Amino acid sequence: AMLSFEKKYRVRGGTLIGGDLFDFWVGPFYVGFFGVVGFCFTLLGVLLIVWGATIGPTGPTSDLQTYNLWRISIAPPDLSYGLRMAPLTEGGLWQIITICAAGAFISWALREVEICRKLGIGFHVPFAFSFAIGAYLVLVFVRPLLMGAWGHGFPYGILSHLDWVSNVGYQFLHFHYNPAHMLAISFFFTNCLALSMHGSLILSVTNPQKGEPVKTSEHENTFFRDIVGYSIGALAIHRLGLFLALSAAFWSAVCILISGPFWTRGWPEWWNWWLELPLW
Amino acid sequence: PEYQNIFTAVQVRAPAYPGVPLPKGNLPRIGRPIFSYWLGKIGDAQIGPIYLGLTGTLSIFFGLVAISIIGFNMLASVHWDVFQFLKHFFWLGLEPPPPQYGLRIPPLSEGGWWLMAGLFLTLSILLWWVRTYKRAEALGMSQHLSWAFAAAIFFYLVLGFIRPVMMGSWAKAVPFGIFPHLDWTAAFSIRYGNLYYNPFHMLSIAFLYGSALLFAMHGATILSVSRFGGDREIDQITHRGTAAERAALFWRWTMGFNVTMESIHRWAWWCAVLTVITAGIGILLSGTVVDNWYLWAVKHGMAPAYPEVVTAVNPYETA
Amino acid sequence: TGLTDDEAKEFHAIFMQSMYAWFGLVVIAHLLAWLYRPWL
Amino acid sequence: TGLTDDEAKEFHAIFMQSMYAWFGLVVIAHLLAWLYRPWL
Amino acid sequence: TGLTDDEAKEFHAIFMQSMYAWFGLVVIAHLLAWLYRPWL
Amino acid sequence: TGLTDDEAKEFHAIFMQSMYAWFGLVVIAHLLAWLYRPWL
Amino acid sequence: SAGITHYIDAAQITIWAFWLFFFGLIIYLRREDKREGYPLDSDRTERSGGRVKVVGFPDLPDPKTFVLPHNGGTVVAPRVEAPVAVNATPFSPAPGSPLVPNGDPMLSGFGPAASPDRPKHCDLTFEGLPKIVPMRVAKEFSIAEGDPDPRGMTVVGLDGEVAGTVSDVWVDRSEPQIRYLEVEVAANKKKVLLPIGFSRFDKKARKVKVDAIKAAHFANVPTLSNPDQVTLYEEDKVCAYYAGGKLYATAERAGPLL
Amino acid sequence: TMNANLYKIWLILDPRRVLVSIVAFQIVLGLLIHMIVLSTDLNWLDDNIPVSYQALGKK
Amino acid sequence: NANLYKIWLILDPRRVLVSIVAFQIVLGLLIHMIVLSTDLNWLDDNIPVSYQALGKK
Amino acid sequence: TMNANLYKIWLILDPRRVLVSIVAFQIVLGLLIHMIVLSTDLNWLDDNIPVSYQALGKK
Amino acid sequence: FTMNANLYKIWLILDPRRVLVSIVAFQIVLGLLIHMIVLSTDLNWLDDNIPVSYQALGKK
Amino acid sequence: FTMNANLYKIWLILDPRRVLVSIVAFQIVLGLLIHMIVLSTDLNWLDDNIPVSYQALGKK
Amino acid sequence: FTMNANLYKIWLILDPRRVLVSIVAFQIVLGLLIHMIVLSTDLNWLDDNIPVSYQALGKK
Ligand code: BCL
Ligand code: BCL
Ligand code: BCL
Ligand code: BCL
Ligand code: BCL
Ligand code: BCL
Ligand SMILES: CC[C@H]1c2cc3[nH]c4c(c3C)C(=O)[C@H](C(=O)OC)c4c3nc(cc4[nH]c(cc(n2)[C@@H]1C)c(C(C)=O)c4C)[C@@H](C)[C@@H]3CCC(=O)OC/C=C(\C)CCC[C@H](C)CCC[C@H](C)CCCC(C)C
Ligand SMILES: CC[C@H]1c2cc3[nH]c4c(c3C)C(=O)[C@H](C(=O)OC)c4c3nc(cc4[nH]c(cc(n2)[C@@H]1C)c(C(C)=O)c4C)[C@@H](C)[C@@H]3CCC(=O)OC/C=C(\C)CCC[C@H](C)CCC[C@H](C)CCCC(C)C
Ligand SMILES: CC(C)=CCC/C(C)=C/CC/C(C)=C/CC/C(C)=C/CC/C(C)=C/CC/C(C)=C/CC/C(C)=C/CC/C(C)=C/CC1=C(C)C(=O)c2ccccc2C1=O
Ligand SMILES: COC(C)(C)C/C=C/C(C)=C/C=C/C(C)=C/C=C/C(C)=C/C=C\C=C(C)\C=C\C=C(C)\C=C\C=C(C)\C=C\CC(C)(C)OC
Ligand SMILES: [Ca+2]
Ligand SMILES: [Ca+2]
Ligand SMILES: [Ca+2]
Ligand SMILES: [Ca+2]
Ligand SMILES: [Ca+2]
Ligand SMILES: [Fe+3]
Secondary structure: OOOOOHHHOOOOOOOEOEOOOOOOEEOOEEOOOOHHHHHHHHHHHHOHHHHHHHHOOOOOOOOOOOOOOOOOEEOOOOOOOOOOOOOOOOOHHHHHHHHHHHHHHHHHHHHHHHHHHHOOOOOHHHHHHHHHHHHHHOOOOHHHHOOOOOOOOOOEEOOHHHHHHHHHHHOOOOHHHOHHHHHHHHHHHHHHHHHHHHHHHHOOOOOOOOOOOOOOHHHHHHHHHHOOOOOOOHHHHHHHHHHHHHHHHHHHHHHHHOOEOOEOOOHHHHOHHHHOOOOO | OOOOOOOOOOEEEOOOOOOOOOOOOOOOOEOOOEEOOOHHHOOOOEEOOEOOOHHHHHHHHHHHHHHHHHOHHHHHHOOOOHHHHHHOOOOOOOOOOOHHHOOOOOOOOOOHHHHHHHHOOOHHHHHHOHHHHHHHHOOOOOOOHHHHHHHHHHHHHOOOOOOHHHOOOOOOOOOOOHHHHHHHHHHHHHHOOOHHHOHHHHHHHHHHHHHHHOOOOHHHHHHHOOOOOHHHHHHHHOOOOOHHHHHHHHHHOOOOOOOOOOHHHHHHHHHHHHHHHHHHHHHHHHHHOOOOHHHHHHHOOOOOOOOOOOOOOOHHHHO | OOOOOHHHHHHHHHHHHHHHHHHHHHHHHHHHHHHHOOOO | OOOOHHHHHHHHHHHHHHHHHHHHHHHHHHHHHHHHOOOO | OOOOHHHHHHHHHHHHHHHHHHHHHHHHHHHHHHHHOOOO | OOOOHHHHHHHHHHHHHHHHHHHHHHHHHHHHHHHHOOOO | OOOOOOOOOOHHHHHHHHHHHHHHHHHHHHHHHHOOOOOOOOOOOOOOOOOOOOOOOOOOOOOEEEEOOOOOOEEEEOOOOOOOOOOOEEOOOOOOOOEEOOOOHHHHOOHHHOOOOOOOOOOEOOOOOEOEOOOOOHHHOEEOOOOOOOOOOOEEOOOOOEOOOOOOOOOEOOOOEOOEEEEOOOOOOOOEEEEHHHOEEEOOOOEEEOOOOOOHHHOOOOOOOOOOOOOHHHHHHHHHHHHHHOOOOOHHHHOOOO | OOHHHHOOHHHHOOHHHHHHHHHHHHHHHHHHHHHHHHHHHOOOOOOOOOOOOOOOOOO | OOHHHHHHHOOOHHHHHHHHHHHHHHHHHHHHHHHHOOOOOOOOOOOOOOOHHHHHO | OOHHHHOHHHHOOOHHHHHHHHHHHHHHHHHHHHHHHHOOOOOOOOOOOOOOHHHHHHO | OOOOOOHHHHHHOOOHHHHHHHHHHHHHHHHHHHHHHHHHOOOOOOOOOOOOHHHHOOOO | OOOOOOHHHHHHHOOHHHHHHHHHHHHHHHHHHHHHHHHHOOOOOOOOOOOOOOOHHHHO | OHHHHHHHHHHHOOOHHHHHHHHHHHHHHHHHHHHHHHHHOOOOOOOOOOOOOOHHHHHO
């Protein structure tokens, strides 16, 4: 099927590393050379993981082994097997899944590109997505490497993956003082503010007061030019945004790549270089 | 190799546009608007002018007061010795009243200034929401900021008036300093189970994510199709075009379904509001409700279960 | 502004008074209370 | 600015009456206060 | 700026008498407190 | 720039003078200061 | 939570609450999502998902009435739309197969360079005059004190070789931002609006390279009806062209690399 | 004494802004008064009167 | 008091007005507090009698 | 002394800036006094006398 | 001002408004800055020595 | 002034205004920094020794 | 300045303003930075030792 006006954009080709073969759609999705692969991993994961759900802790029999998202979780191998394929049962499986998921985001990521091409548009989207992609590597790869352990990454638990942070986080006591985590946090906030403004304003100009005209920038560019005094501008908002977020991510990315392989003391301490300044 | 709308390459300028004039009641705007090439190499280089009504001043005033308290008391700490004030800055602060005067007006010393200053960052904050809805519709504008602002301002009160005062504790209310405040969240997680187990937080997260997600997409998307006036959404909302044509289409042949140059801006305003919403939720439950969310969780069949390579002993029992 | 000299004062009085309804309502509230629980 | 000496002057007295009105309304507030519980 | 010499000197004068208005009202202020609660 | 040699001196002279008024004003401040609590 | 029923208390009620009104509001959006572009067109495939409903689970919302600005018709949504043409032939009859841009794609007006027919009325400013205008009427403007003035910069095809130059850089009364540059082409000796969004500045050599369309294509660039102002209709019109270049200007581009 | 001169003010100050805003100013303060008296000064409800509302109720 | 009138020829009266009104609203809300907090908490602490202390008990 | 040549001051300095800047300074400064002083020993509110009317009346 | 007499020139390059106002602030701050840095450790007449009796002796 | 002789050409490449207002701060800051830093540890003449113990002898 | 003979050409590729004022900041920081490092560690000539404590002996 197609959108009211989609029927007129589905050109031929535009693919990246080949794909002029499966260069077609299905439902509302373009396949290509990446919609294809990503799929593979998807089931050889979304389901490969099912095996895990099946297996569980001890075994598929252990009263420990359950089928409640809230609990189900695939655990990485022991730090034992450092940078080596662990026994699926003991770790590998986890690795396997993770193996896939990597590509599934590398495909869909690229697939995005082929699209970005077809629809002869800008590529800000994927490029952005990549960061988000990366932050997933430098948080289950770039780090665990400089820790010589694959099993040294994190789990795949609906909420189980929560603790994994709880710990590695306290491993430095007041993780909160991590310089990055502070900023990286700040962003994931600022973003959730500007956003709660743009997406608001707009939905307040195009659908303004009763019996009123679809307001124009000649308002917007003043809306805040009144409350706060200044207005970043309209084009801008759609900049500051990506900015914030595409940074917040990359930040946090740092945030946990350095926590450990680049710093072992409790963060609170790091903050000492400050104090000790030959001045105060 | 196409000019990816990063920083407005070449700029241009025209006189100070003091916005659309306002009705009978909206006092004169004020300020002699300025320009900054730099600031402007990102957005509307013009600066100001800004409005200032009653709540406008009334609120701003109630603002630079708490600051002049939470600011003062703080400096006092490091015995008016700025040098260290500068040093122990990120550490300093102003704590609330001691568990005794749970709700009673704390003495001029013991956590007093904080309750004082607090209420003045309780009104001015609430008063500034007025400096919105007011200056908002007096622009012929509907209300969606004013709305959200609440959702957020809601959570703020879930960290005070509504809960701290709800448990009789001029302590259960966050401190007043970057680090110490940075500690309150820490302290909290503990005192009561471990937040990672109170859904309404593990929830309010996904949102603080989505926003960190979406307004991060649509920010790009727009840009991607900003050549095709995507940035001009305004009209695209009304008279569509190739912008919302190329855009949404993307997501159509990507994640399948998709929406409109309008809709998106909706989810936007939503995820956002649906954030501080879920925030103040848990924070409200956590306290006068469940006391340990970890127990809650598992007691509901939530909290997971792993093997056991390590366990300890219990003095209170064997001893 | 936005007004003249006549219709203007028409309001001055019109409301001025009303308000006293309050000050008075308030004073009945502040006196009736004082009689009840002595505060100091 | 945006006014002349005429319209201005008038404003000066009219509000001045109400201004001292404060100095008076609040002076009675204190004087009766100092009476109640002497401070310093 | 925005004015000439004439309007300038006139302002300065009245503007002064208003400043000595303070110093005097504040110095007399200090003194009254100085008598009551001696600092130093 | 924006000014010429002629008023260059005039602004120069008016400002220079006052500056020394404070230098004498404060030097004196540090004088009564030393008188009260001697330092170093 | 996955098994069925276990614990029982208060707060756990509420978690159900929000996590209910969510699944409600979720639909609200769904509908609000559908306004324009709906309903769908062909049957090349069916609705992928859990419950394959006729056309979207959330019954299409009702018409919305957009009260345009002064001297402006009124728009609504949804709002049935008149089918368009498809200047292309399906490479394959298979549902979901691509459509080749018959004849010269560069202007065949398809996908990579297709576009809708926005209103043929120059979008105006606050009071009346039209927003996007050339620096002609935009005489009350001035280049950003510092930024090297683009007026006089020779455009240069993505092939490198020159392709006309520039003229007036269409500013805006709404936001002092350049949105277009007049490009007095070389062969046509005409005027082709340059979409800054597609114009890459090279303040080093007075040039302005546009890796979008070959130098020649500046001739096939949709011509402006009037030079003193451009209407929404064409606002999309000029753009969409260069756009195609992204997947046309060279046999290379369009076809895969590996 | 000062009542007569002031009426000329209405022309200079809009009634609606001053009237409806005060409507709130009056409502906001009175809410935050019971808020202060109720919070610290005295709790006329659980204060004096046989607090044994549950001591003689829960029994 | 004589020459004080001329001020209205340069500064917008409405401004100083709304400026003053906001200044006396916070201050008062401040003072009553800055004092009720320390000097004499006339509200709760000394009078009239403890209907709660000598009563509730 | 100073006044005669000081009228020329307003010839470069706007009356508004001085009128606006000074009010802001006198009050914030005034506030940072009783304030920094109040918290100082010569406190007057709850520090000493008059006779502990609170300590006496209360109990 | 044996040498600072030929300075007259400066004013054109140094804008009067920029130099006048801006310096009256640096003073308005440092004023407080000093009194604070000194009031902090050196000696504190406010809580350093008598009269400080009324506070303790005069209190209760 | 081994080099200070031909050094005059300096005004030509360096903006008079930019260099003039810059040292204005660097010196304004460097100096407040130095008195801040020295006064912090080396000799804190403020709360350090004599003449008399305004605090010690006066407070008690 | 032997290089000079062959070194003059450098300035055609390196803008005078870009390298002149640029190094001026470099010299200014490194320097401030060094005293900061040395001083803080090696020997803190300031509060570190001799001639001897003055505030310590005069205080007590
Ligand atoms: C121990 C508890 C500590 C703590 C420990 C940690 C630890 C440990 C870590 C963080 C990390 C982060 N923390 Mg912390 N943190 C604490 C308290 C906080 C608070 C708070 C208010 O209290 C905040 C706001 C934050 C904020 C943050 C972020 C800055 C940061 C990154 C998150 C992220 O988005 O990665 C972005 C991630 C991704 C884009 C990857 C996932 C997306 C992938 C590519 C796609 C998935 C597709 C899917 C499989 C397919 C199916 C389809 C489905 C529909 C989805 N922390 C406490 C004090 N925090 C993490 C970090 O810094 O990461 C860099 C981290 O590792
Ligand atoms: C501290 C020891 C005493 C005490 C001593 C004092 C002293 C001393 C004073 C007060 C004053 C006030 N006290 Mg008391 N007070 C005590 C206990 C209380 C308690 C209590 C619950 O226990 C309360 C609720 C109050 C409440 C009040 C306020 C009614 C009043 C004004 C404050 C103010 O500055 O507003 C800010 C002001 C304004 C918003 C506007 C000013 C009003 C004028 C008259 C209107 C302007 C004219 C305009 C052009 C027309 C439009 C009108 C409106 C703007 C719409 N007091 C204790 C017992 N109180 C002050 C007072 O009563 O002044 C008369 C005062 O001086
Ligand atoms: C503190 C010790 C006493 C006590 C002492 C006092 C004293 C003393 C006073 C009050 C007053 C009030 N008390 Mg009490 N009160 C106590 C216990 C209570 C309890 C309780 C459950 O125990 C309650 C519920 C209340 C509630 C109330 C309010 C009804 C009343 C006004 C408050 C207010 O801000 O109005 C907000 C006000 C306004 C909006 C403005 C005026 C109303 C106008 C006319 C309506 C708007 C008109 C507009 C132009 C038209 C548009 C319509 C809509 C507004 C849009 N008190 C205890 C027992 N209380 C005050 C009072 O009742 O005065 C009469 C008062 O002076
Ligand atoms: C600390 C020991 C003493 C004490 C000693 C002193 C001393 C000593 C002084 C004060 C002074 C003041 N004290 Mg005290 N004070 C005490 C306890 C108190 C308490 C209390 C609750 O216990 C209170 C509320 C106050 C409150 C006050 C203020 C009313 C007053 C001025 C401060 C200021 O910054 O002016 C700053 C001024 C301004 C912002 C305005 C600018 C002035 C010019 C001249 C007017 C503007 C002109 C304009 C263009 C015309 C338009 C007119 C209108 C603005 C519309 N004090 C204790 C008991 N107090 C000061 C004072 O009142 O001096 C007279 C003072 O010198
Ligand atoms: C340290 C122990 C001593 C003490 C020792 C000293 C010493 C030593 C000095 C002071 C000085 C000052 N002290 Mg002390 N001081 C003590 C206790 C106090 C207390 C107190 C409550 O206990 C107070 C309130 C003060 C207050 C003051 C200030 C009056 C004064 C200058 C401040 C300033 O920087 O403005 C700064 C300047 C400006 C804003 C502008 C520059 C001034 C120019 C000349 C004219 C303005 C021109 C303008 C362009 C024209 C337009 C006019 C208007 C701006 C519109 N001291 C204790 C008892 N104090 C200083 C002083 O007063 O010197 C005379 C000083 O040297
Ligand atoms: C560490 C143990 C010693 C010590 C050892 C050293 C040593 C060793 C050295 C210094 C140096 C310096 N030390 Mg030491 N120093 C000590 C204690 C101190 C104390 C102290 C309070 O105790 C202080 C305040 C200082 C301060 C200083 C600076 C004066 C000085 C240079 C800084 C610089 O990098 O220039 C920054 C540079 C620039 C801004 C520009 C580059 C210079 C060019 C050539 C001129 C500019 C040309 C321009 C284009 C023309 C326009 C002219 C104007 C700019 C308009 N030292 C202790 C006792 N110190 C350095 C020094 O003085 O070298 C001479 C040095 O080598
Ligand atoms: C700052 C960057 C923000 C961001 C951006 C972002 N996300 C994006 C994009 C962008 C720009 C897309 O373009 C893409 C998208 O939606 O394209 C249409 C996407 C996307 N962001 C997604 C998720 C996501 N993003 C997140 C965050 C963020 N994304 C950041 C906040 C988060 C979290 C936790 O914060 C999540 C969960 C996806 C919905 C989508 C990418 C979908 C995709 O490529 O899926 C491929 C694979 C499958 C559909 C099948 C899965 C099979 C695998 C083998 C299993 C993997 C298991 C997994 C590792 C374990 C998970 C368990 C946990 C609970 C522990
Ligand atoms: C999901 C909801 C998100 C959100 C939403 C949100 N925030 C909002 C809004 C909304 C909808 C507004 O409408 C409002 C806003 O910006 O309105 C224009 C706002 C706002 N969100 C703000 C902050 C904020 N929001 C945050 C978060 C969030 N807000 C959530 C992520 C956070 C955090 C903790 O991450 C912060 C810090 C403010 C910028 C603004 C509300 C401002 C307000 O109420 O101001 C009252 C007045 C004052 C504080 C007076 C200021 C005094 C002077 C003007 C300044 C002088 C200098 C200063 C004192 C420095 C000290 C110097 C001394 C030497 C003197
Ligand atoms: C027992 C049991 C049931 C077992 C299960 C067994 C099963 C089902 C096995 C199969 C497993 C498999 C293969 C699963 C995969 C199935 C597939 C393909 C699922 C789809 C995957 C996918 C990525 C879905 C989307 C994920 C979601 C919903 C993410 C939410 C993030 C979010 C809020 C996105 C917003 C989406 C929207 C509205 C996009 C539209 C949109 C955006 C974002 C603009 O910016 C924009 C700008 C200008 C104009 C228009 C637009 C516009 O329309
Ligand atoms: C000396 O100071 C000078 C002069 C140098 C000026 C400088 C000032 C500076 C630098 C100030 C800096 C301030 C900073 C850094 C502040 C930081 C604050 C932070 C990080 C705060 C973080 C969280 C704060 C929270 C959550 C606050 C919540 C407050 C609440 C909920 C208050 C509620 C008040 C209520 C409900 C009051 C009700 C009235 C009563 C009490 C009467 O009801 C009974
Ligand atoms: Ca604390
Ligand atoms: Ca009392
Ligand atoms: Ca006293
Ligand atoms: Ca003393
Ligand atoms: Ca000394
Ligand atoms: Fe948008």
